[PDB]
mmCIF file with all atom_site columns, C-alpha atoms and ligand atoms in Angstrom:
data_model
loop_
_atom_site.group_PDB
_atom_site.id
_atom_site.type_symbol
_atom_site.label_atom_id
_atom_site.label_alt_id
_atom_site.label_comp_id
_atom_site.label_asym_id
_atom_site.label_entity_id
_atom_site.label_seq_id
_atom_site.pdbx_PDB_ins_code
_atom_site.Cartn_x
_atom_site.Cartn_y
_atom_site.Cartn_z
_atom_site.occupancy
_atom_site.B_iso_or_equiv
_atom_site.pdbx_formal_charge
_atom_site.auth_seq_id
_atom_site.auth_comp_id
_atom_site.auth_asym_id
_atom_site.auth_atom_id
_atom_site.pdbx_PDB_model_num
ATOM   1   C  CA  . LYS A 1 1   ? -11.367 -2.391  -5.096  1.00 0.00 ? 1   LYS A CA  1
ATOM   2   C  CA  . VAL A 1 2   ? -12.150 0.105   -7.843  1.00 0.00 ? 2   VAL A CA  1
ATOM   3   C  CA  . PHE A 1 3   ? -11.172 3.539   -6.512  1.00 0.00 ? 3   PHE A CA  1
ATOM   4   C  CA  . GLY A 1 4   ? -12.854 6.804   -7.224  1.00 0.00 ? 4   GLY A CA  1
ATOM   5   C  CA  . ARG A 1 5   ? -10.664 9.489   -8.755  1.00 0.00 ? 5   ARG A CA  1
ATOM   6   C  CA  . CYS A 1 6   ? -10.542 11.822  -5.740  1.00 0.00 ? 6   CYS A CA  1
ATOM   7   C  CA  . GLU A 1 7   ? -10.494 8.904   -3.304  1.00 0.00 ? 7   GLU A CA  1
ATOM   8   C  CA  . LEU A 1 8   ? -7.293  7.605   -4.915  1.00 0.00 ? 8   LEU A CA  1
ATOM   9   C  CA  . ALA A 1 9   ? -5.765  11.088  -5.038  1.00 0.00 ? 9   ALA A CA  1
ATOM   10  C  CA  . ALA A 1 10  ? -6.367  11.532  -1.308  1.00 0.00 ? 10  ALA A CA  1
ATOM   11  C  CA  . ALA A 1 11  ? -4.912  8.106   -0.508  1.00 0.00 ? 11  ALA A CA  1
ATOM   12  C  CA  . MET A 1 12  ? -1.876  8.769   -2.707  1.00 0.00 ? 12  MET A CA  1
ATOM   13  C  CA  . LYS A 1 13  ? -1.299  12.150  -1.079  1.00 0.00 ? 13  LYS A CA  1
ATOM   14  C  CA  . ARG A 1 14  ? -1.561  10.657  2.405   1.00 0.00 ? 14  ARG A CA  1
ATOM   15  C  CA  . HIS A 1 15  ? 1.038   8.029   1.457   1.00 0.00 ? 15  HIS A CA  1
ATOM   16  C  CA  . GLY A 1 16  ? 3.473   10.731  0.325   1.00 0.00 ? 16  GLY A CA  1
ATOM   17  C  CA  . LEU A 1 17  ? 3.269   10.576  -3.490  1.00 0.00 ? 17  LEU A CA  1
ATOM   18  C  CA  . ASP A 1 18  ? 2.442   14.278  -4.092  1.00 0.00 ? 18  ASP A CA  1
ATOM   19  C  CA  . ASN A 1 19  ? 5.645   15.715  -5.641  1.00 0.00 ? 19  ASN A CA  1
ATOM   20  C  CA  . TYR A 1 20  ? 7.644   12.598  -4.812  1.00 0.00 ? 20  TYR A CA  1
ATOM   21  C  CA  . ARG A 1 21  ? 10.836  12.903  -6.910  1.00 0.00 ? 21  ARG A CA  1
ATOM   22  C  CA  . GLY A 1 22  ? 9.215   15.995  -8.395  1.00 0.00 ? 22  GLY A CA  1
ATOM   23  C  CA  . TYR A 1 23  ? 6.114   14.308  -9.847  1.00 0.00 ? 23  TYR A CA  1
ATOM   24  C  CA  . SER A 1 24  ? 2.950   16.159  -8.910  1.00 0.00 ? 24  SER A CA  1
ATOM   25  C  CA  . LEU A 1 25  ? -0.080  14.219  -7.712  1.00 0.00 ? 25  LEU A CA  1
ATOM   26  C  CA  . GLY A 1 26  ? -1.871  14.472  -11.077 1.00 0.00 ? 26  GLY A CA  1
ATOM   27  C  CA  . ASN A 1 27  ? 0.882   12.369  -12.699 1.00 0.00 ? 27  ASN A CA  1
ATOM   28  C  CA  . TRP A 1 28  ? 0.199   9.455   -10.338 1.00 0.00 ? 28  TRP A CA  1
ATOM   29  C  CA  . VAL A 1 29  ? -3.593  9.599   -10.780 1.00 0.00 ? 29  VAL A CA  1
ATOM   30  C  CA  . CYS A 1 30  ? -3.194  9.776   -14.566 1.00 0.00 ? 30  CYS A CA  1
ATOM   31  C  CA  . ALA A 1 31  ? -0.801  6.806   -14.506 1.00 0.00 ? 31  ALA A CA  1
ATOM   32  C  CA  . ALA A 1 32  ? -3.172  4.742   -12.349 1.00 0.00 ? 32  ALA A CA  1
ATOM   33  C  CA  . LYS A 1 33  ? -6.106  5.587   -14.624 1.00 0.00 ? 33  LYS A CA  1
ATOM   34  C  CA  . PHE A 1 34  ? -4.471  4.322   -17.793 1.00 0.00 ? 34  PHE A CA  1
ATOM   35  C  CA  . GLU A 1 35  ? -2.538  1.443   -16.199 1.00 0.00 ? 35  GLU A CA  1
ATOM   36  C  CA  . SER A 1 36  ? -5.421  -0.163  -14.304 1.00 0.00 ? 36  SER A CA  1
ATOM   37  C  CA  . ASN A 1 37  ? -8.569  1.983   -14.643 1.00 0.00 ? 37  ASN A CA  1
ATOM   38  C  CA  . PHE A 1 38  ? -8.240  2.510   -10.862 1.00 0.00 ? 38  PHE A CA  1
ATOM   39  C  CA  . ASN A 1 39  ? -8.757  -1.236  -10.195 1.00 0.00 ? 39  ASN A CA  1
ATOM   40  C  CA  . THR A 1 40  ? -6.505  -2.790  -7.535  1.00 0.00 ? 40  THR A CA  1
ATOM   41  C  CA  . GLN A 1 41  ? -7.209  -6.296  -8.926  1.00 0.00 ? 41  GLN A CA  1
ATOM   42  C  CA  . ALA A 1 42  ? -5.960  -5.546  -12.455 1.00 0.00 ? 42  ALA A CA  1
ATOM   43  C  CA  . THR A 1 43  ? -3.459  -8.002  -13.952 1.00 0.00 ? 43  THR A CA  1
ATOM   44  C  CA  . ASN A 1 44  ? -1.842  -8.179  -17.383 1.00 0.00 ? 44  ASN A CA  1
ATOM   45  C  CA  . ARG A 1 45  ? 0.665   -10.621 -18.833 1.00 0.00 ? 45  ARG A CA  1
ATOM   46  C  CA  . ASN A 1 46  ? 3.716   -9.421  -20.741 1.00 0.00 ? 46  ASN A CA  1
ATOM   47  C  CA  . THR A 1 47  ? 5.268   -11.061 -23.783 1.00 0.00 ? 47  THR A CA  1
ATOM   48  C  CA  . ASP A 1 48  ? 8.295   -12.323 -21.818 1.00 0.00 ? 48  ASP A CA  1
ATOM   49  C  CA  . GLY A 1 49  ? 6.051   -14.267 -19.404 1.00 0.00 ? 49  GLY A CA  1
ATOM   50  C  CA  . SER A 1 50  ? 6.154   -11.694 -16.610 1.00 0.00 ? 50  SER A CA  1
ATOM   51  C  CA  . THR A 1 51  ? 2.946   -10.182 -15.225 1.00 0.00 ? 51  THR A CA  1
ATOM   52  C  CA  . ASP A 1 52  ? 1.928   -6.672  -14.128 1.00 0.00 ? 52  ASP A CA  1
ATOM   53  C  CA  . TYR A 1 53  ? -0.053  -6.330  -10.898 1.00 0.00 ? 53  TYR A CA  1
ATOM   54  C  CA  . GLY A 1 54  ? -2.347  -3.842  -9.257  1.00 0.00 ? 54  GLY A CA  1
ATOM   55  C  CA  . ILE A 1 55  ? -3.313  -0.225  -9.568  1.00 0.00 ? 55  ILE A CA  1
ATOM   56  C  CA  . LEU A 1 56  ? 0.128   0.760   -10.933 1.00 0.00 ? 56  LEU A CA  1
ATOM   57  C  CA  . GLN A 1 57  ? 0.765   -2.481  -12.890 1.00 0.00 ? 57  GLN A CA  1
ATOM   58  C  CA  . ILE A 1 58  ? 4.054   -3.295  -11.175 1.00 0.00 ? 58  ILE A CA  1
ATOM   59  C  CA  . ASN A 1 59  ? 6.030   -5.954  -13.086 1.00 0.00 ? 59  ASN A CA  1
ATOM   60  C  CA  . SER A 1 60  ? 7.111   -9.359  -11.739 1.00 0.00 ? 60  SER A CA  1
ATOM   61  C  CA  . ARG A 1 61  ? 10.254  -9.273  -13.909 1.00 0.00 ? 61  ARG A CA  1
ATOM   62  C  CA  . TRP A 1 62  ? 11.979  -6.970  -11.378 1.00 0.00 ? 62  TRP A CA  1
ATOM   63  C  CA  . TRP A 1 63  ? 9.762   -5.917  -8.493  1.00 0.00 ? 63  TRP A CA  1
ATOM   64  C  CA  . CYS A 1 64  ? 7.730   -8.752  -6.938  1.00 0.00 ? 64  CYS A CA  1
ATOM   65  C  CA  . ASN A 1 65  ? 7.588   -12.552 -6.669  1.00 0.00 ? 65  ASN A CA  1
ATOM   66  C  CA  . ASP A 1 66  ? 4.630   -14.388 -8.227  1.00 0.00 ? 66  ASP A CA  1
ATOM   67  C  CA  . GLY A 1 67  ? 6.178   -17.877 -8.326  1.00 0.00 ? 67  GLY A CA  1
ATOM   68  C  CA  . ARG A 1 68  ? 5.924   -18.066 -12.131 1.00 0.00 ? 68  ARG A CA  1
ATOM   69  C  CA  . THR A 1 69  ? 8.590   -15.657 -13.494 1.00 0.00 ? 69  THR A CA  1
ATOM   70  C  CA  . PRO A 1 70  ? 11.777  -17.734 -13.366 1.00 0.00 ? 70  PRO A CA  1
ATOM   71  C  CA  . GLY A 1 71  ? 15.039  -15.849 -13.363 1.00 0.00 ? 71  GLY A CA  1
ATOM   72  C  CA  . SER A 1 72  ? 13.427  -12.597 -12.202 1.00 0.00 ? 72  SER A CA  1
ATOM   73  C  CA  . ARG A 1 73  ? 14.118  -10.255 -9.300  1.00 0.00 ? 73  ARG A CA  1
ATOM   74  C  CA  . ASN A 1 74  ? 11.979  -9.258  -6.322  1.00 0.00 ? 74  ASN A CA  1
ATOM   75  C  CA  . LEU A 1 75  ? 13.325  -5.776  -5.589  1.00 0.00 ? 75  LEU A CA  1
ATOM   76  C  CA  . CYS A 1 76  ? 10.303  -4.702  -3.509  1.00 0.00 ? 76  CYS A CA  1
ATOM   77  C  CA  . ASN A 1 77  ? 10.558  -7.916  -1.433  1.00 0.00 ? 77  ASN A CA  1
ATOM   78  C  CA  . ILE A 1 78  ? 6.844   -8.716  -1.661  1.00 0.00 ? 78  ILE A CA  1
ATOM   79  C  CA  . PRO A 1 79  ? 4.603   -11.350 -3.174  1.00 0.00 ? 79  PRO A CA  1
ATOM   80  C  CA  . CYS A 1 80  ? 2.937   -9.893  -6.244  1.00 0.00 ? 80  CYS A CA  1
ATOM   81  C  CA  . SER A 1 81  ? -0.509  -10.688 -4.821  1.00 0.00 ? 81  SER A CA  1
ATOM   82  C  CA  . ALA A 1 82  ? 0.106   -8.100  -2.085  1.00 0.00 ? 82  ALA A CA  1
ATOM   83  C  CA  . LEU A 1 83  ? -0.158  -5.509  -4.881  1.00 0.00 ? 83  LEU A CA  1
ATOM   84  C  CA  . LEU A 1 84  ? -3.796  -6.483  -5.520  1.00 0.00 ? 84  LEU A CA  1
ATOM   85  C  CA  . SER A 1 85  ? -5.002  -5.497  -2.037  1.00 0.00 ? 85  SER A CA  1
ATOM   86  C  CA  . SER A 1 86  ? -7.607  -2.807  -1.384  1.00 0.00 ? 86  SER A CA  1
ATOM   87  C  CA  . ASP A 1 87  ? -4.898  -1.268  0.852   1.00 0.00 ? 87  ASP A CA  1
ATOM   88  C  CA  . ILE A 1 88  ? -2.580  0.446   -1.640  1.00 0.00 ? 88  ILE A CA  1
ATOM   89  C  CA  . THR A 1 89  ? 0.304   0.801   0.820   1.00 0.00 ? 89  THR A CA  1
ATOM   90  C  CA  . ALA A 1 90  ? 2.433   -1.927  -0.778  1.00 0.00 ? 90  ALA A CA  1
ATOM   91  C  CA  . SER A 1 91  ? 1.869   -0.569  -4.300  1.00 0.00 ? 91  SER A CA  1
ATOM   92  C  CA  . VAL A 1 92  ? 2.786   2.987   -3.258  1.00 0.00 ? 92  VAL A CA  1
ATOM   93  C  CA  . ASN A 1 93  ? 5.917   1.927   -1.363  1.00 0.00 ? 93  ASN A CA  1
ATOM   94  C  CA  . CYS A 1 94  ? 7.075   -0.197  -4.297  1.00 0.00 ? 94  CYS A CA  1
ATOM   95  C  CA  . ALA A 1 95  ? 6.261   2.627   -6.749  1.00 0.00 ? 95  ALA A CA  1
ATOM   96  C  CA  . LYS A 1 96  ? 8.554   4.912   -4.730  1.00 0.00 ? 96  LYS A CA  1
ATOM   97  C  CA  . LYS A 1 97  ? 11.471  2.550   -5.360  1.00 0.00 ? 97  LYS A CA  1
ATOM   98  C  CA  . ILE A 1 98  ? 10.715  2.249   -9.087  1.00 0.00 ? 98  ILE A CA  1
ATOM   99  C  CA  . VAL A 1 99  ? 10.503  6.000   -9.707  1.00 0.00 ? 99  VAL A CA  1
ATOM   100 C  CA  . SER A 1 100 ? 13.839  6.428   -7.885  1.00 0.00 ? 100 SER A CA  1
ATOM   101 C  CA  . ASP A 1 101 ? 15.733  3.958   -10.116 1.00 0.00 ? 101 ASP A CA  1
ATOM   102 C  CA  . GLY A 1 102 ? 16.941  6.597   -12.610 1.00 0.00 ? 102 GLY A CA  1
ATOM   103 C  CA  . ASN A 1 103 ? 14.164  6.542   -15.221 1.00 0.00 ? 103 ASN A CA  1
ATOM   104 C  CA  . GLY A 1 104 ? 11.502  8.377   -13.210 1.00 0.00 ? 104 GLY A CA  1
ATOM   105 C  CA  . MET A 1 105 ? 7.921   7.783   -14.275 1.00 0.00 ? 105 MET A CA  1
ATOM   106 C  CA  . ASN A 1 106 ? 9.074   6.797   -17.786 1.00 0.00 ? 106 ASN A CA  1
ATOM   107 C  CA  . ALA A 1 107 ? 9.076   3.312   -16.212 1.00 0.00 ? 107 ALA A CA  1
ATOM   108 C  CA  . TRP A 1 108 ? 5.290   3.303   -16.748 1.00 0.00 ? 108 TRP A CA  1
ATOM   109 C  CA  . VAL A 1 109 ? 4.588   3.011   -20.476 1.00 0.00 ? 109 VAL A CA  1
ATOM   110 C  CA  . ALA A 1 110 ? 1.056   4.339   -20.074 1.00 0.00 ? 110 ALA A CA  1
ATOM   111 C  CA  . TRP A 1 111 ? 2.363   7.431   -18.294 1.00 0.00 ? 111 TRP A CA  1
ATOM   112 C  CA  . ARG A 1 112 ? 4.875   8.246   -21.038 1.00 0.00 ? 112 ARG A CA  1
ATOM   113 C  CA  . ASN A 1 113 ? 2.356   7.617   -23.816 1.00 0.00 ? 113 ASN A CA  1
ATOM   114 C  CA  . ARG A 1 114 ? -0.813  9.114   -22.295 1.00 0.00 ? 114 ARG A CA  1
ATOM   115 C  CA  . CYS A 1 115 ? 0.139   11.461  -19.428 1.00 0.00 ? 115 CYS A CA  1
ATOM   116 C  CA  . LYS A 1 116 ? 3.556   12.993  -20.120 1.00 0.00 ? 116 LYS A CA  1
ATOM   117 C  CA  . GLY A 1 117 ? 3.206   16.391  -21.761 1.00 0.00 ? 117 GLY A CA  1
ATOM   118 C  CA  . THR A 1 118 ? -0.497  16.762  -20.997 1.00 0.00 ? 118 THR A CA  1
ATOM   119 C  CA  . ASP A 1 119 ? -2.282  18.817  -18.345 1.00 0.00 ? 119 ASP A CA  1
ATOM   120 C  CA  . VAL A 1 120 ? -2.015  16.179  -15.612 1.00 0.00 ? 120 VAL A CA  1
ATOM   121 C  CA  . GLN A 1 121 ? -3.385  18.556  -12.960 1.00 0.00 ? 121 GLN A CA  1
ATOM   122 C  CA  . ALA A 1 122 ? -6.798  18.092  -14.588 1.00 0.00 ? 122 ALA A CA  1
ATOM   123 C  CA  . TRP A 1 123 ? -6.912  14.631  -12.970 1.00 0.00 ? 123 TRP A CA  1
ATOM   124 C  CA  . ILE A 1 124 ? -7.238  16.117  -9.469  1.00 0.00 ? 124 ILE A CA  1
ATOM   125 C  CA  . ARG A 1 125 ? -9.522  19.028  -10.351 1.00 0.00 ? 125 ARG A CA  1
ATOM   126 C  CA  . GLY A 1 126 ? -12.544 19.155  -8.084  1.00 0.00 ? 126 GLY A CA  1
ATOM   127 C  CA  . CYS A 1 127 ? -11.007 17.068  -5.294  1.00 0.00 ? 127 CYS A CA  1
ATOM   128 C  CA  . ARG A 1 128 ? -10.797 18.195  -1.661  1.00 0.00 ? 128 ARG A CA  1
ATOM   129 C  CA  . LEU A 1 129 ? -7.089  17.635  -1.069  1.00 0.00 ? 129 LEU A CA  1
HETATM 130 NA NA1 . LIG B 2 .   ? 9.974   -11.471 -9.721  1.00 0.00 ? 1   LIG B NA1 1
#
């Protein structure tokens, strides 16, 4: 599923991401935009052989099991393919554990490089939230 901007914002708000650990909703929409272009089926391979999955590009090195990242962890206790669903519940619940691990949203390289220090509230402008 490719989400619309306000559609994703509404779904993220319903699932409790607005101001989670102090990050306003615009941060999460901005991160999703530049991580996956709002596409739940997005995948990208990393140099160490791990793979990033879904709308927030969650990494198989630490967070999910894809059967092909030997020596890695599965801290969200899910198969990585669950992160590609049109239902974003698994991605949001796993994202909540990542952002709580001490580094905040700096865990997402696209957020630090393209969202942090910008007017992230612009990403929800116009939405009925
Ligand atoms: Na893993």
